[PDB]
Design an enzyme around this catalytic site. Structure first.
Site, PDB file in Angstrom:
ATOM      1  N   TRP A   9       1.527   4.117 -18.276  1.00 46.56           N
ATOM      2  CA  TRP A   9       1.606   5.347 -17.501  1.00 46.56           C
ATOM      3  C   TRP A   9       2.094   6.532 -18.322  1.00 46.56           C
ATOM      4  O   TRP A   9       2.096   7.660 -17.816  1.00 46.56           O
ATOM      5  CB  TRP A   9       2.523   5.150 -16.282  1.00 46.56           C
ATOM      6  CG  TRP A   9       2.248   3.885 -15.511  1.00 46.56           C
ATOM      7  CD1 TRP A   9       2.965   2.724 -15.559  1.00 46.56           C
ATOM      8  CD2 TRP A   9       1.176   3.653 -14.586  1.00 46.56           C
ATOM      9  NE1 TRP A   9       2.411   1.787 -14.719  1.00 46.56           N
ATOM     10  CE2 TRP A   9       1.312   2.331 -14.110  1.00 46.56           C
ATOM     11  CE3 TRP A   9       0.115   4.434 -14.112  1.00 46.56           C
ATOM     12  CZ2 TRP A   9       0.427   1.774 -13.184  1.00 46.56           C
ATOM     13  CZ3 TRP A   9      -0.762   3.877 -13.191  1.00 46.56           C
ATOM     14  CH2 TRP A   9      -0.600   2.561 -12.739  1.00 46.56           C
ATOM     15  N   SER A  63       0.435   7.367  -4.978  1.00 44.65           N
ATOM     16  CA  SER A  63       1.858   7.699  -5.120  1.00 44.65           C
ATOM     17  C   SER A  63       2.023   9.199  -4.901  1.00 44.65           C
ATOM     18  O   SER A  63       1.669   9.684  -3.812  1.00 44.65           O
ATOM     19  CB  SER A  63       2.352   7.157  -6.463  1.00 44.65           C
ATOM     20  OG  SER A  63       3.741   6.883  -6.439  1.00 44.65           O
ATOM     21  N   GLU A  96       5.853  -2.966  -2.543  1.00 43.84           N
ATOM     22  CA  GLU A  96       5.897  -1.573  -2.975  1.00 43.84           C
ATOM     23  C   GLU A  96       7.175  -1.233  -3.731  1.00 43.84           C
ATOM     24  O   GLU A  96       7.178  -0.303  -4.544  1.00 43.84           O
ATOM     25  CB  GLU A  96       5.755  -0.650  -1.764  1.00 43.84           C
ATOM     26  CG  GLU A  96       4.341  -0.520  -1.241  1.00 43.84           C
ATOM     27  CD  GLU A  96       3.496   0.406  -2.088  1.00 43.84           C
ATOM     28  OE1 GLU A  96       4.069   1.173  -2.891  1.00 43.84           O
ATOM     29  OE2 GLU A  96       2.256   0.366  -1.950  1.00 43.84           O
ATOM     30  N   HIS A 103       3.975  -1.629  -7.286  1.00 43.33           N
ATOM     31  CA  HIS A 103       3.409  -0.334  -6.940  1.00 43.33           C
ATOM     32  C   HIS A 103       2.516   0.178  -8.062  1.00 43.33           C
ATOM     33  O   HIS A 103       2.919   0.203  -9.229  1.00 43.33           O
ATOM     34  CB  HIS A 103       4.537   0.657  -6.674  1.00 43.33           C
ATOM     35  CG  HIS A 103       4.085   2.073  -6.523  1.00 43.33           C
ATOM     36  ND1 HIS A 103       3.690   2.600  -5.311  1.00 43.33           N
ATOM     37  CD2 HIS A 103       3.986   3.079  -7.422  1.00 43.33           C
ATOM     38  CE1 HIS A 103       3.362   3.869  -5.473  1.00 43.33           C
ATOM     39  NE2 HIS A 103       3.531   4.183  -6.745  1.00 43.33           N
TER      40      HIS A 103
END
Lengths: 540, 540
Positions: free
Chosen positions: A83, A200, A331, A444
């Site tokens: 990410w 998100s 989550e 998540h």
């Protein structure tokens, strides 16, 4: 052939690149400028449209990533660094990307528009997991994704002033939507069949566009994956946004010692600071205060959002709108390693009774001591109140329900009961290549790789069943983009996906098994958050 | 010429490289293996000598940096990233480097041996600021520097056991000293005139070699810059080293859930973990403690150190030993940005009265509440008890005195009063190219660039005055390496540097001005730490 890699838009000419997939080629136009670079005096200001250019802009590679904090929790770890920015950081980052099938569609084709997440403080459209070459090839749809300013550069707000109005990162997305209306036809896309889908903070952004009149006229359908605008982390008040912006100015030495600090001199001092300096002091604007407490998020000022997202959702008409919402099975487990005591991705995180009592304070911040108790007593199995494994999954549910699942279920119920057609899912498949520990289940953000058909990449070690499963998910998302209904328009063999209503509360489970209908998006748990907790906080 | 870049040592043949300086060439041999790679079953074990090799080992570039935490406090900042690893990380890191003048010295030349600092958790001999091409060219001395295992790989200790005896990072330095005795003659160096000089944890390592009999026979002089073995951070007890090692095993999942954990099964489980996994859980072995509390430091087990460094210093004979100790003017300012509330390198850090009270708890950890007040009341100016600027320098002194200046002065006094000839200095020049804020003054570690003659690098923007100042400092260090006396053996024009005695307590100030003699290494402040505080901590 090579003639289709040349496209003219309202601003000028572009040369794209052909991407390869195991099922055929795809035309990609990566790095299209849609706004003037927001540097210098343009920092913290709403975006200006990109003025036309002479010649042929190169559109064969992703452009720069907007300045953002880089995660350093587990250096060298795939689960976290997937990410992180994969291009160089720069304030000159307002660029979008367009994928289109080969041969180029002759007929107007529905358009999917991706908005990445990252808590409004990180993210980029260039991440390998957002690669749209597989979704476009297998479903012959047009995919668009843009970069928007995150962190202080996109959401620092001194409300009332004109130098830092706030929500400019949301305006970057809107300008990219206006660009799609004016230019997606040049790529074979239908500007009257636009489907926003985010995840998100991206899902929260998609929801905030539904609640903003100027943005509502730029798309027709919405998909919100593991996020919603009414989440406790997605917005901030005007007074708190002013305190956080002033604190950041103090941390970087603004204003200079012997000087006054009205909203004009403060932003002038901030505009003289290097970008990396502002980033290096973002997280200890709220110290500390890390898990689900982001310093710069959309502000409720009365402009972009005329009221709070909760108020606009309740008093809103949603007739003629199709929404696809959903969450993952676990989550909250991903966020626990970011500050919950006793948690570590490298052991079993078998927390104690005391660590569970403290973990609720981090996962559910800014709550009274009586409210924290009610959370513990609601999520405790009183036949096994000391079992570490059950306490671990309990805190995972506490964090997952408070921040994701229940704000989504609250939104999905109000939409379906006020005109909108809503479909709901729960992603329950753990990827065979997942690098996170087993106890996190389906963390998540790990449904995105299946929506974008990443398992079709032959250089990756997914199973054969996951490849077929990824193709089935892409058809679900493509059908919803085309017809507003995830079910195949003519196939009765596969099980059906019933709409989500406020009464039946039906959803489907997405995994390697065929579709299975269930009822209740954590109905018992979300009644505690959406119905009881506002009552316990009312009478302090 | 090129024939001098070929040298044979007791293990094999090496090819070096010619380095350029504005005053002539230098021969460098970077990357000489002095021990077998401590990987696999050799992790946590004492080093084995490097077995002889066939052919010509390449020695033209620095080898790998030992696995270590990477500082991420201010990403992209020169002041912090100049200490981060500049080569790739690997457990195969036991290599040393030898600089030698051109032409090679025909006569035996004194040898300087550098030991880098970094709190026993970081550091590398390959950093640009440790480049020895300038010190060797201008003073015709032989410079040696080695890498030693830091962090858990060098100092994880299960005391008593044979698989993790601890202090193996100190044994890496000792083995590199045995290598110098057996091979420095091949480079033109005198193995009977070896001068150890280190900084911070390196200076603490130099002191621990003075107090270890097997290491004392491998060198003849010592230089301790801004560090000492008796510092509160430099050692740990046997019980605490066992608790920290066991906690790290727990954080990485050792032992597996259904398994016992004696010292053999625990270290076996640790040896199966990747190196980066152990590093990612090093800092929260001590949760929420960073400033001057490093997890893995030398342990007082009875082997390398037969007793505590304080006990060995008091009951020790140091006749026939020359020591050069010193500190910088502002030893504590660098560490304040690492956890003291209200501190930030990007503003003025004008802390409040409450922030000063809290900062003493971080800079002086693990002290009674009564002891914290005696610190506050000794360092408070009671005519200006609320002045933020004075409170900032006060906390800077509190941290600098407790951790660096007073442990050094305690050691320098005991050495001079027990046979050793001691010279003392205080570095009071702030580099014109320093990237840290002005309020930090002369921070910790920023005398190293002047000892190594870095201002002579024409690609850097130092002043002409700093170039002459660096050459004068290099002669001081070189003269001490040769004759054990920093003063020029025959020049009476320059002011003299009187030795440091326990009574007169004389030292010199190192800056652009000529030498100036002063008395007292913070004599009043260090009496509080070395004489009164142990009296308050005895009676709880």
């Amino acid at each position: 052939e090579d003639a289709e890699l040349l496209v003219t838009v309202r601003g000028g000419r572009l040369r794209g690149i052909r991407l390869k997939t195991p099922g055929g080629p795809v035309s990609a136009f990566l790095g299209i400028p849609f706004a003037e670079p927001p540097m210098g005096p343009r920092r913290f200001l709403p975006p200006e449209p990109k003025q036309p250019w002479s010649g042929v802009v190169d559109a064969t590679t992703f452009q720069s990533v907007c300045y953002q904090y880089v995660d350093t929790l587990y250096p060298g770890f795939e689960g976290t660094e997937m990410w992180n920015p994969n291009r160089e950081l720069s304030e000159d980052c307002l660029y979008l990307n367009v994928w289109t099938p080969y041969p180029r569609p002759t007929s107007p084709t529905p358009v999917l528009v991706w908005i990445y997440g990252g808590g409004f403080y990180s993210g980029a459209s260039s991440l390998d997991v957002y690669d749209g070459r597989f979704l476009v090839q297998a479903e012959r749809t047009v995919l668009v994704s843009m970069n928007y300013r995150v962190g202080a550069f996109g959401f620092l707000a001194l409300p009332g002033s004109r130098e830092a109005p706030g929500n400019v990162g949301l305006l970057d997305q809107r300008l990219a939507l206006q660009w799609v209306q004016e230019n997606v036809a040049a790529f074979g896309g239908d500007p009257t069949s636009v489907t926003l889908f985010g995840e998100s903070a991206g899902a929260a952004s998609v929801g905030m566009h539904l609640l903003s009149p100027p943005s509502r006229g730029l798309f027709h359908r919405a998909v919100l994956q593991s996020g919603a605008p009414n989440g406790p982390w997605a917005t901030v008040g005007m007074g708190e946004a002013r305190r956080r912006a002033t604190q950041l100015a103090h941390l970087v030495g603004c204003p200079p010692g012997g000087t006054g600090g009205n909203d004009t001199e403060l932003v002038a001092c901030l505009r003289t600071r290097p970008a990396q300096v502002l980033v290096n002091h973002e997280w200890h604007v709220l110290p500390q205060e890390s898990v689900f407490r982001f310093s710069f998020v959309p502000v409720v000022d009365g402009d972009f959002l005329s009221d709070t997202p909760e108020a606009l959702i309740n008093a809103g008409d949603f007739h003629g709108l199709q929404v696809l919402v959903g969450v993952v099975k676990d989550e909250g487990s991903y966020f626990l390693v970011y500050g919950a005591p006793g948690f570590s991705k490298d052991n079993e995180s078998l927390i104690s009774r005391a660590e569970f009592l403290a973990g609720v304070r981090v996962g559910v911040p800014q709550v009274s001591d009586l409210a924290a108790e009610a959370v513990v007593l609601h999520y405790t199995d009183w036949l096994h109140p000391e079992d570490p494994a059950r306490l671990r999954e309990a805190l995972s549910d506490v964090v997952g329900d408070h921040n994701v699942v229940c704000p989504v279920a609250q939104l999905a119920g109000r939409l379906a009961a006020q005109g909108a057609r809503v479909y709901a899912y729960v992603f329950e498949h753990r990827a065979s290549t997942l690098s996170w520990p087993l106890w996190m289940g389906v963390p998540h953000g790990y449904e995105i790789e299946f929506i974008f058909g990443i398992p079709l990449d032959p250089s990756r070690n997914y199973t054969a069943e996951e490849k077929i499963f990824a193709q089935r998910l892409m058809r679900y998302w493509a059908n919803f983009a085309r017809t507003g209904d995830p079910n195949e328009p003519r196939d009765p063999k596969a099980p059906q996906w019933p709409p989500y209503t406020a009464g039946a509360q039906q959803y489907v489970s997405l995994d390697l098994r065929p579709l299975e209908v269930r009822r209740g998006l954590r109905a018992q748990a979300c009644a505690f958050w959406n119905r009881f907790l506002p009552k316990l906080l009312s009478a302090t």
